From Swiss-Prot:
Site note Significant for high potency for Kv1.2/KCNA2, residues: 9
Note: Negative results: has no or very low potency for Kv1.1/KCNA1, Kv1.3/KCNA3, Kv1.4/KCNA4, Kv1.5/KCNA5, Kv1.6/KCNA6, Kv7.2/KCNQ2-Kv7.3/KCNQ3, and KCa1.1/KCNMA1.
Source taxon at top rank: Eukaryota
Residues carrying 4-hydroxyproline: 2-3, 7-8, 13, 15, 21
Chief localization: secreted
GO cellular component: extracellular region
Domain remark text: The cysteine framework is III (CC-C-C-CC).
The protein's name in its UniProt record: Kappa-conotoxin RIIIJ
């Protein structure tokens, strides 16, 4: 998937968005 750190899918509800420095940090 594309950069999770984006308006489209910024939220990190699922694991797929575990590599989101914007959500982890």
């Amino acid at each position: 998937l594309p950069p999770c750190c984006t308006p489209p899918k910024k939220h990190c509800p699922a694991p797929a968005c575990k590599y989101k420095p914007c959500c982890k940090s």
